[model samples]
Target: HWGYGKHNGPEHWHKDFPIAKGERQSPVDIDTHTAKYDPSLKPLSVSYDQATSLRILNNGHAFNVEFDDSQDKAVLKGGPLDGTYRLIQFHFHWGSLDGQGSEHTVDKKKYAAELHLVHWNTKYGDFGKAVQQPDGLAVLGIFLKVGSAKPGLQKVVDVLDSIKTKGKSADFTNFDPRGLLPESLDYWTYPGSLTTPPLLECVTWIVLKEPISVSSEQVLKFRKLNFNGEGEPEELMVDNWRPAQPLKNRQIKASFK
Candidate 1:
């Protein structure tokens, strides 16, 4: 199985998932000096129905909050996207320490953590079918810094105790994740793939320029979760992020000048 442990980490992933070396792989380093300002890009449009928020689970890798995607209750549009993309689920990538965690870095700068809001295009029927197309998915990446408390994040951390081990989950209702975002939506857009295994090259990444704040206390709670399941060997769920991949034959576009 794939994991972020020393034996099964990113360096060893390409052994089983050849696409890990493919062009357009995700979590690339965002060097602002090279990012070109694209006046043509529009501001991102994100609308969420808090009620659509459902259960939260730890899938051995990261903790995820799944949504009700039967219809377009929550959707994303504009910003490098052709059609309305239905919100699927949102998860996070973190680290063992406070200094180095996030997936995508700014000028080689790493944050304490990162959040990924995953959405799939509605044109291809559903998430399963859409993930195979070139313009299938759009993920909003928000960096998380260790500073002040984020009220929205506290709601998530409060429930982490219930899911301290892999395969654990709990009902999470009426939580609007937008509250967890930074004030500015200025972002960098690029063509990339899923950072994890089965690394499909179908994602259009929208990484925000500004990072939101979360307390160091909250992050400690995140590390308490175990990568191993109950009755198995215990391994902390830290450093679950994939490192920056090669940015080959692709240009990063910025919404802000």
Candidate 2:
């Protein structure tokens, strides 16, 4: 039921969520000279374990997978970061077609798509309560690009056949979101607000520099998702991305020391 109106998008999200006016909105321009340059900002560890509680929900815009954080594994402990954060929901943003699907742009170039893995600090119990806190949320952004050959994203694409309708979803009973992560843990970290409505500035963004590749056919499958219900297909769910905004003096630190 969510449609993008002039006042409904990110541009006006700050009104409802006052915190959006902060200087730390994400997808900010990454300038090395302007950044504080903290090389030790990398993840303390990166791990994936059996995800038996993964549930998929179709929210009219995209398919979101909610995970049961009680079952996760940390494979690599990179830096001295907090361990209280637990993985929660993972979703994606795409374009109408293969040529433009990225949410965050750099120097006017767009990637095929963007996947967000949302996590919450276990300190506040669950995601709902955690999202109200300042440092309660962590989002890992994975960029997606189009290509001829099908990459490892086929597993995710396979599920699209089930949730093809707006607000229609399947359990995704046997899928593990951990398999979707990129091989590289190196990332850019910064404090930022959510790109969606009620754009709370409670997220710690970890944007991966490297993009994952998916076939053009897979990208087309994503476009098949409808934005409206059973009415005339006004807008396809493709191209659900927002352009990058200004950094406003905020610095993006890398995790590579």
Candidate 3:
């Protein structure tokens, strides 16, 4: 029952996922003033394919847009990474309320939602193994704003009906995730762990500085999802996000001033 609930929420995560208290915990509050701008940071280079997008699934926790990463079908490079990282999946996290869902924030400010494009370093040759080592994974976190409807999001929304229940999934394809990125590649980087269970300290987090906008109505559709299955006690999947954690001694690097 390690969920985002009053009884089993983040506060209790360390009970099982001890890595939750690890030095490099994620979802830290980003203090722009204190963040150091790294001149050596390279521009991010992304190469994604619509064909690699294989399926969409509602995993009772969040909806995931999976990819076929058997080869270098899609990859992310440059920008605080040592080697090529192939795409595994991209997913979203949101709040029950309009302005309180995102995990990471700027100047201690939260966002409406966050999108995580998960990738793993190819040097290890296997994602499972990589998750256990440092520099094994890289996640691109994009902040979300409430505004006018976005066509890029519409494609994702269209697939929601097909996966309204937990464990339910549908064939998803022909959509490039690049269309969802903000205008600027400017971002903040830090060494951190996954924001979820078994919180492995393997991710090199790259959080975008600019946020993409989505209509409030479109965001409402996400609330209709269920954290339980078809016959379960019907709890709507809202507020499935983690709270900010301690920054400790980790350095948050910026690609821009």
Candidate 4:
């Protein structure tokens, strides 16, 4: 029952999932001043088909929109990745307030929320196998700020009522995730681990420099989601973000100077 609650939250996770204490842990604070501008890093490429979207589910921790990864209809390449990576799913983490929510921080500043597009390396054959490798995953991190409403995100918020409780889900077809991306592809990248439990250190984190805008009212809809399943006591699914971890020896590289 690892959750964002007091007794079973991020700080207590290392007791159950030892890897939570491992080096290269994620959600690190990106001190932009220290990030090196690497001229050699290729521009990140993302191609996602609308039909690749399958369903949206509330997995207790956070809600995720699953994608069809059987083939390469939706994939990410270039950037810090060595090869093509198939899109598996996309999810988000947020806080109770607009001031603090995003997992990764920029100069110690948190956004209203963060979106993660999870992908697995094609060279690894499968996600399970890829998860075991250092370069197993390439996660595109997009920070969400409070501002004008974003139509793409509103489409997702409109379906929140149907999945208010844990384990609830609904078919979410023909949703183009590209609508959620910022206009610029500039990003800061680093070697990191999954922010959640069983935090495997296999992710090449590509966190976008620009953030997408979503109205305050739209973000409130996300809080309507419940952490508890049906019949249990209601707990708002807010502050689901893990606090930024130590940077240690890793170097964050910027695509732009």
Candidate 5:
């Protein structure tokens, strides 16, 4: 298992793993004030059945959920995103500790964590084949912060014990990914690329402005992951996040209307 660490960080990730150098790198900075903010975008409505198939996969890097495209019935009836797009896989980006976690930032403020719900355009068939196309992806970004508590996210932490061991996984049956969504569906949209390898630029990003809250204890549970093959039986993994990159000349839009 090639883990993430200080010696081999995201910056050098592409060197060891050539696929990582894709044009769409994640952990972007989301600013509403940017001129790209569009007043006409809207949120995509996900259905109940589609939410259940959101299975959590314990892929060494982080816990991710594979969204079954066959079950993606969520559609944008009318708006900027009127076309059909299927939900793909969903994952997270976090910090070694609670102080910093979110993949995207605004004015240099980092949240506790960031949730990525990946999707692909159905125009190219399924996610597997669509991911290769320049206009094949769409990702929903949800920010998580340390606060009072979150009953919805408890479902994820409830099964953490099963995957405590490296490369270990548990059956996340009948799970509802929508339960993890914040009360507000408002978001900021943009055209970008995947944060990981094969960094395809076909991504349409929908980053929510309002963040959800999780307990400090939950944050600690995340740190228990092992990125190194040595040290204590379970050495706390610190800094599992990538530093923010410049937006260059890219425009960021929002759905405030």
Candidate 6:
């Protein structure tokens, strides 16, 4: 029931959800100097299909694009995963801050925004069953900097206007999640939890090192998505990012040094 606001934000989430303060929490400050370049780390491999794309919705928390993952048509393989992790949903984290909008900060340098492609392990048979398991989820994180206009993202941006209010969703088809990623496959792998509530430590995070470009005008589109539905306070959906958590004992593995 906690939200990112002037009152009960990330700092106060722990009071309602204990896992918000868990050791394996996500959105950590990725210090490249301190990260270990393990030769044993495997390269990432993604295979996402356009047909499996479902819908785009305003989840009050963020604008999430859903996927039908009953099959392994759009799955994430390799990169710290033993089996297939099918695409379930994808979302973004943006803000009022220019370079501090991202949830996961690399070398403490946040970008204009951050995008997440959420997947659940097929090893657990189903997504609902997967969430409770440690090896049940994998999320791809891509940082978006303020630069050239991202034409590839226009399809997603266009739908935001329709689903502007919370709990609103519209049909979206033939939209490939792969279109949102950068050209480089290079990334840093770490064990972490979901950035939001219920903060399950079930994610194997693959954070792209190469930043994606999005114009200032595109960033404003994200602000247009409101958190409140019809009659609420009509809060503009901005600053949905969680602050960096304690790194604790987990080691950050780089695919490339």
| Backbone clash numbers for all candidates listed | 0, 12, 0, 0, 6, 0
| TM-score of each candidate structure, all chains considered together | 0.98, 0.86, 0.97, 0.98, 0.86, 0.97
* Per-residue lDDT of 95 in model 2: 83
| Candidate 3 wrongly placed segments (more than 4 Å) | 49-51
CA lDDT scores, all candidates in order: 0.92, 0.69, 0.90, 0.93, 0.68, 0.87
Model 1, 174-239: lDDT tens digits are 878778789999999999999999889999999999999999999999999998899998889999
How much does candidate 4 score in TM-score? 0.98
Error of 4 at 238 (Å): 0.2
lDDT of 6 by residue, 1-257 (tens): 67899788898888888998788999899999888887876667898754377899898989888888767788888877897888888999998867668999988887889999998899789888898998889999999998888887889988888999989999998887767878998999999999998788999999999989998888889888898996788789999999899999889988896
- Sort by lDDT, best first: what order? 4, 1, 3, 6, 2, 5
Residues 1-257, candidate 4, lDDT per residue (tens digit)?
79998899999999988988788999999999999999999988988753388999999989999988887788999988898999999999998999989999999999999999999999999899999999999999999999999988888999999999999999998788988999999999999998998899999999999999999999999999999998899999999999988888889999998
What's the CA error at residue 136 for candidate 1, in Å?
0.4
Better of 1 and 6 by lDDT: 1
lDDT of 3 at 123: 93
- Residue 153 in candidate 1 has what lDDT? 87
- Candidate 2 or 5, higher lDDT? 2
Report the lDDT tens digits of candidate 2 across residue range 94-213.
887767777766545678899987877777777789779888788878888886544446766878777776766777655666666767876777788777766677887877777887
Greater-TM-score candidate between 1 and 2 = 1
Name model 1 segments beyond 4 Å from true: none
